[PDB]
Design an enzyme around this catalytic site. Structure first.
Site, PDB file in Angstrom:
ATOM      1  N   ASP A 116     -13.363   1.704   3.668  1.00  0.00           N
ATOM      2  CA  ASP A 116     -12.904   0.563   2.884  1.00  0.00           C
ATOM      3  C   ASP A 116     -11.814  -0.271   3.555  1.00  0.00           C
ATOM      4  OD1 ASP A 116     -12.868  -0.641  -0.104  1.00  0.00           O
ATOM      5  OD2 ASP A 116     -10.802  -0.439   0.596  1.00  0.00           O
ATOM      6  N   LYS A 142     -13.367  -7.280   1.983  1.00  0.00           N
ATOM      7  CA  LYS A 142     -13.180  -8.069   0.784  1.00  0.00           C
ATOM      8  C   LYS A 142     -12.703  -9.489   1.042  1.00  0.00           C
ATOM      9  CE  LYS A 142     -11.605  -3.712  -1.268  1.00  0.00           C
ATOM     10  NZ  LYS A 142     -10.878  -3.133  -0.110  1.00  0.00           N
ATOM     11  N   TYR A 190      -5.757  -6.409   4.519  1.00  0.00           N
ATOM     12  CA  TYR A 190      -5.220  -5.308   5.309  1.00  0.00           C
ATOM     13  C   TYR A 190      -4.850  -5.656   6.760  1.00  0.00           C
ATOM     14  CZ  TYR A 190      -7.366  -2.978   1.251  1.00  0.00           C
ATOM     15  OH  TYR A 190      -7.756  -2.672  -0.031  1.00  0.00           O
ATOM     16  N   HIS A 216     -11.896  -9.321  -3.940  1.00  0.00           N
ATOM     17  CA  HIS A 216     -10.750  -8.418  -4.004  1.00  0.00           C
ATOM     18  C   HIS A 216     -10.008  -8.375  -5.349  1.00  0.00           C
ATOM     19  CE1 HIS A 216      -7.675  -6.495  -1.024  1.00  0.00           C
ATOM     20  NE2 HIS A 216      -7.578  -5.927  -2.211  1.00  0.00           N
TER      21      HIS A 216
HETATM   22  N1  LIG Z   1      -9.048  -3.475  -4.220  1.00  0.00           N
HETATM   23  C1  LIG Z   1      -7.797  -3.161  -4.466  1.00  0.00           C
HETATM   24  O1  LIG Z   1      -7.096  -3.804  -5.231  1.00  0.00           O
HETATM   25  C2  LIG Z   1      -7.141  -1.960  -3.777  1.00  0.00           C
HETATM   26  C3  LIG Z   1      -5.739  -1.622  -4.071  1.00  0.00           C
HETATM   27  C4  LIG Z   1      -5.172  -0.504  -3.406  1.00  0.00           C
HETATM   28  C5  LIG Z   1      -5.925   0.266  -2.473  1.00  0.00           C
HETATM   29  N2  LIG Z   1      -7.296  -0.115  -2.216  1.00  0.00           N
HETATM   30  C6  LIG Z   1      -8.081   0.688  -1.197  1.00  0.00           C
HETATM   31  O2  LIG Z   1      -8.205   2.089  -1.622  1.00  0.00           O
HETATM   32  C7  LIG Z   1      -7.479   2.953  -0.700  1.00  0.00           C
HETATM   33  C8  LIG Z   1      -6.705   4.057  -1.358  1.00  0.00           C
HETATM   34  O3  LIG Z   1      -5.734   3.516  -2.281  1.00  0.00           O
HETATM   35  P1  LIG Z   1      -4.196   3.690  -1.950  1.00  0.00           P
HETATM   36  O4  LIG Z   1      -3.892   2.860  -0.772  1.00  0.00           O
HETATM   37  O5  LIG Z   1      -3.320   3.504  -3.140  1.00  0.00           O
HETATM   38  O6  LIG Z   1      -4.082   5.195  -1.511  1.00  0.00           O
HETATM   39  P2  LIG Z   1      -4.253   6.626  -2.159  1.00  0.00           P
HETATM   40  O7  LIG Z   1      -5.553   7.145  -1.601  1.00  0.00           O
HETATM   41  O8  LIG Z   1      -3.848   6.646  -3.506  1.00  0.00           O
HETATM   42  O9  LIG Z   1      -3.127   7.275  -1.302  1.00  0.00           O
HETATM   43  C9  LIG Z   1      -2.958   8.656  -1.314  1.00  0.00           C
HETATM   44  C10 LIG Z   1      -1.606   8.780  -0.580  1.00  0.00           C
HETATM   45  O10 LIG Z   1      -1.467  10.239  -0.590  1.00  0.00           O
HETATM   46  C11 LIG Z   1      -1.452  10.809   0.692  1.00  0.00           C
HETATM   47  N3  LIG Z   1      -2.563  11.727   0.870  1.00  0.00           N
HETATM   48  C12 LIG Z   1      -3.861  11.553   1.301  1.00  0.00           C
HETATM   49  N4  LIG Z   1      -4.574  12.662   1.317  1.00  0.00           N
HETATM   50  C13 LIG Z   1      -3.675  13.614   0.864  1.00  0.00           C
HETATM   51  C14 LIG Z   1      -3.836  14.996   0.662  1.00  0.00           C
HETATM   52  N5  LIG Z   1      -4.944  15.731   0.871  1.00  0.00           N
HETATM   53  N6  LIG Z   1      -2.721  15.704   0.190  1.00  0.00           N
HETATM   54  C15 LIG Z   1      -1.497  15.054  -0.068  1.00  0.00           C
HETATM   55  N7  LIG Z   1      -1.314  13.695   0.123  1.00  0.00           N
HETATM   56  C16 LIG Z   1      -2.432  13.024   0.592  1.00  0.00           C
HETATM   57  C17 LIG Z   1      -1.533   9.648   1.723  1.00  0.00           C
HETATM   58  O11 LIG Z   1      -0.424   9.722   2.602  1.00  0.00           O
HETATM   59  P3  LIG Z   1      -0.596  10.117   4.170  1.00  0.00           P
HETATM   60  O12 LIG Z   1      -1.153   8.866   4.841  1.00  0.00           O
HETATM   61  O13 LIG Z   1       0.799  10.432   4.544  1.00  0.00           O
HETATM   62  O14 LIG Z   1      -1.588  11.270   4.227  1.00  0.00           O
HETATM   63  C18 LIG Z   1      -1.674   8.375   0.922  1.00  0.00           C
HETATM   64  O15 LIG Z   1      -0.595   7.465   1.153  1.00  0.00           O
HETATM   65  C19 LIG Z   1      -6.715   1.962   0.256  1.00  0.00           C
HETATM   66  O16 LIG Z   1      -6.529   2.467   1.576  1.00  0.00           O
HETATM   67  C20 LIG Z   1      -7.556   0.716   0.201  1.00  0.00           C
HETATM   68  O17 LIG Z   1      -8.614   0.782   1.132  1.00  0.00           O
HETATM   69  C21 LIG Z   1      -7.894  -1.219  -2.867  1.00  0.00           C
HETATM   70  C1  LIG Z   2      -3.665  -6.582 -11.304  1.00  0.00           C
HETATM   71  C2  LIG Z   2      -4.733  -5.819 -10.495  1.00  0.00           C
HETATM   72  N1  LIG Z   2      -4.652  -5.784  -9.156  1.00  0.00           N
HETATM   73  C3  LIG Z   2      -5.207  -6.742  -8.376  1.00  0.00           C
HETATM   74  O1  LIG Z   2      -5.856  -7.750  -8.906  1.00  0.00           O
HETATM   75  C4  LIG Z   2      -5.068  -6.637  -6.835  1.00  0.00           C
HETATM   76  C5  LIG Z   2      -3.619  -6.971  -6.428  1.00  0.00           C
HETATM   77  C6  LIG Z   2      -3.490  -7.204  -4.900  1.00  0.00           C
HETATM   78  C7  LIG Z   2      -3.712  -5.960  -4.081  1.00  0.00           C
HETATM   79  C8  LIG Z   2      -2.801  -4.949  -3.935  1.00  0.00           C
HETATM   80  C9  LIG Z   2      -1.444  -4.951  -4.599  1.00  0.00           C
HETATM   81  C10 LIG Z   2      -0.198  -4.927  -3.645  1.00  0.00           C
HETATM   82  C11 LIG Z   2      -0.249  -6.020  -2.558  1.00  0.00           C
HETATM   83  C12 LIG Z   2       0.445  -7.234  -3.035  1.00  0.00           C
HETATM   84  C13 LIG Z   2      -0.061  -8.440  -2.782  1.00  0.00           C
HETATM   85  C14 LIG Z   2       0.654  -9.653  -3.257  1.00  0.00           C
HETATM   86  O2  LIG Z   2       1.187 -10.363  -2.158  1.00  0.00           O
HETATM   87  C15 LIG Z   2      -0.322 -10.563  -4.007  1.00  0.00           C
HETATM   88  C16 LIG Z   2      -0.594 -10.019  -5.431  1.00  0.00           C
HETATM   89  C17 LIG Z   2      -1.345 -11.040  -6.230  1.00  0.00           C
HETATM   90  C18 LIG Z   2      -0.666 -11.801  -7.238  1.00  0.00           C
HETATM   91  C19 LIG Z   2      -1.376 -12.783  -7.995  1.00  0.00           C
HETATM   92  C20 LIG Z   2      -2.763 -12.997  -7.745  1.00  0.00           C
HETATM   93  C21 LIG Z   2      -3.446 -12.236  -6.743  1.00  0.00           C
HETATM   94  C22 LIG Z   2      -2.736 -11.265  -5.991  1.00  0.00           C
HETATM   95  C23 LIG Z   2       0.461  -5.443  -1.328  1.00  0.00           C
HETATM   96  O3  LIG Z   2      -0.153  -5.928  -0.161  1.00  0.00           O
HETATM   97  C24 LIG Z   2       0.295  -3.924  -1.422  1.00  0.00           C
HETATM   98  C25 LIG Z   2       0.081  -3.588  -2.910  1.00  0.00           C
HETATM   99  O4  LIG Z   2      -0.991  -2.693  -3.021  1.00  0.00           O
END
Ligand SMILES: NC(=O)c1ccc[n+]([C@@H]2O[C@H](COP(=O)([O-])OP(=O)(O)OC[C@H]3O[C@@H](n4cnc5c(N)ncnc54)[C@H](OP(=O)(O)O)[C@@H]3O)[C@@H](O)[C@H]2O)c1
Ligand SMILES: CCNC(=O)CCC/C=C\C[C@@H]1[C@@H](/C=C/[C@@H](O)CCc2ccccc2)[C@H](O)C[C@@H]1O
Length: 319
Positions: free
Chosen positions: A46, A80, A51, A113
């Site tokens: 992903d 995205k 990013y 996104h």
């Molecule tokens: N579309 C969206 O709005 C959105 C928003 C946020 C994230 N995402 C995507 O989804 C992914 C995951 O979300 P997230 O970034 O919040 O991360 P997450 O997967 O909730 O992060 C888990 C955190 O826990 C640690 N971790 C991982 N495996 C572990 C294990 N086995 N035991 C203990 N700790 C562990 C990691 O640190 P270490 O690196 O130190 O292992 C990581 O920082 C992102 O990388 C991104 O691709 C999408």
């Molecule tokens: C509510 C649900 N979440 C969403 O929709 C997705 C929100 C954007 C993605 C991730 C959230 C923040 C990121 C913050 C980005 C901001 O700069 C822009 C936020 C924003 C405000 C208004 C409109 C669009 C985006 C940062 O990089 C790391 C952290 O993970």
């Protein structure tokens, strides 16, 4: 590693690797960890324009093909469309640049996104003199129609959305002349925010729920709710970890797998990367699942309160 069939006919590995890391982390790490992820067993990666790592992640994918480890068809890759590119005429151009960055011919999945549109331009986060984010107003149905044209052209194997609530999904689902339903809705989903109602709704429409921040979140002081409890510190998850001789993270991931949710897991630690694929090695009982269900507190780690004014803020509705 099993898969889930999308309403597309396409298959999506239920275990995905999260590539996002804060800007403080060297851009070089994304390349190494994604390769480590692949070698460990991850087949779903992903990424996103936000990013700023698509070149690295894409290179990591192509390096694993070049060294004969995997075939392009073995990897499920997603990127995205950022909120500053919601305007229709900016959609395909955004996908093509993403494809160029990753040096791929197609993306397995391309998502909107976030439903919250932002001012178009160069900045990822366009702000005013007061540090306030400048919003934009776009008909997401037109954004979606542009999304459909990318799929028509073969640039995206599947297309979907992210952070949409029920109303916003229904909007796309009820759009006249709709050609493609989104195959998924990637949202924040963990034991403290299990999104039960949205999940059931998505399943009713054949939309898969993909969980992010499934292991809590990365807890960036800049963007996390300062008062939020630490998921991996949860006493129930820890009790379950002991019972199953696993870790709280593995328990939190398995929970998602058993309720039919595709789970993402971000880790830039080689040992945790490899540990995470062990989610397929055990299973939780019905009572285990029941206890976890009770942990739900409608908690989203992202500190978005300052965007609740955005007309497309997804958290304003029950779900
Ligand atoms: N579309 C969206 O709005 C959105 C928003 C946020 C994230 N995402 C995507 O989804 C992914 C995951 O979300 P997230 O970034 O919040 O991360 P997450 O997967 O909730 O992060 C888990 C955190 O826990 C640690 N971790 C991982 N495996 C572990 C294990 N086995 N035991 C203990 N700790 C562990 C990691 O640190 P270490 O690196 O130190 O292992 C990581 O920082 C992102 O990388 C991104 O691709 C999408
Ligand atoms: C509510 C649900 N979440 C969403 O929709 C997705 C929100 C954007 C993605 C991730 C959230 C923040 C990121 C913050 C980005 C901001 O700069 C822009 C936020 C924003 C405000 C208004 C409109 C669009 C985006 C940062 O990089 C790391 C952290 O993970």
């Amino acid at each position: 590693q099993q898969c889930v069939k999308l309403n597309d006919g396409h298959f999506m590995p239920v275990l995905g690797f999260g590539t996002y890391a804060p800007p403080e982390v060297p851009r070089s790490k994304a390349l190494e960890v994604t390769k480590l992820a692949i070698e460990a067993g991850f087949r779903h990666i992903d990424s996103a324009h936000l990013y700023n790592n698509e070149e690295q992640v894409g290179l990591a994918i192509r390096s694993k093909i070049a060294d004969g480890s995997v075939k392009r068809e073995d990897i499920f890759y997603t990127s995205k469309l950022w909120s500053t590119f919601h305007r229709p005429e900016l959609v395909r151009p955004a996908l093509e640049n993403s494809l160029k960055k990753a040096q791929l011919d197609y993306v397995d999945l391309y998502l909107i996104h976030s439903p919250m549109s932002l001012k178009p331009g160069e900045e990822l986060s366009p702000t005013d003199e007061n540090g306030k984010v400048i919003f934009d107003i776009v008909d997401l149905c037109t954004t979606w129609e542009a999304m459909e044209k990318c799929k028509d052209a073969g640039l995206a194997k599947s297309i979907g959305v992210s952070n949409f609530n029920r109303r916003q999904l229904e909007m796309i689902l009820n759009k006249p002349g709709l050609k493609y339903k989104p195959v998924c809705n990637q949202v924040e989903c963990h034991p403290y925010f299990n999104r039960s109602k949205l999940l059931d709704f998505c399943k009713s429409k054949d939309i898969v729920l993909v969980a992010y921040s499934a292991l809590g979140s990365q807890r960036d002081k800049r963007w996390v709710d300062p008062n939020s409890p630490v998921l991996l510190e949860d006493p129930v998850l820890c009790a379950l970890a002991k019972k199953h001789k696993r870790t709280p993270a593995l328990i939190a991931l398995r929970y998602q797998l058993q309720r039919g949710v595709v789970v993402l897991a971000k880790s830039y630690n080689e040992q945790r990367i490899r540990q995470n694929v062990q989610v397929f090695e055990f299973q939780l009982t019905a009572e285990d699942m029941k206890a976890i269900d009770g942990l739900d507190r409608n908690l989203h780690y992202f500190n978005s309160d300052s965007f609740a004014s955005h007309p497309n803020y997804p958290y304003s509705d029950e779900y």
